[PDB]
Amino acid sequence: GDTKEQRILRYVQQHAKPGDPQSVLEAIDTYCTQKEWAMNVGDAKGQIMDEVIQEHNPSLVLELGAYCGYSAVRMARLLSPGARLLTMEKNPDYAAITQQMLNFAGLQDKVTILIGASQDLIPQLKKYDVDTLDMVFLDHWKDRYLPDTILLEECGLLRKGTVLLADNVIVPGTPDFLAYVRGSSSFECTHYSSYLEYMKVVDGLEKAVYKGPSSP
Q: I need a surface site. Which of 1, 104, 147, 157 has the fewest CB within 10 A?
């Protein structure tokens, strides 16, 4: 009852309005900023996440990685009735907090949480009525961004125009993922750096839009 992700969930449950995704996001944000665990996530990554979803209105989003559920709530709240989010996370405790966060926001019908390693679950997406993905959000585990991207290509899950958006890409981290997508002719790349009011990046995100072959 005392991991950071449990403490975030507890704060939301005590302070946020049940069934109101905006209230849930604001409570997570407020708490994490006060604890100095993450400064103003809504401004530093939430607004960029929103824009990327709203510029393409995806029918199917894959989230790789989850911690407390902020990102799943942020994306799931924007999805229209025919659209949905699949979230993969290996850590069963993070997956559980993420599920309870979505429940508190009233968004559980929009999301399917798959507990397992991405290298095991990505090749099984065939078995979930999944041909290709419209958008992929890479969250949290940056050493896995390049392997995950390669595996998505090998499984034929990326089509022309599929948007990959990777959080927590701040130089000089993720040197391999960035060198790959920026050097590859199969991607068009945009980098977002959120400074808030500071001189150093608070969060950085890489948008890599696939333009390569759909079949591996």
A: 1
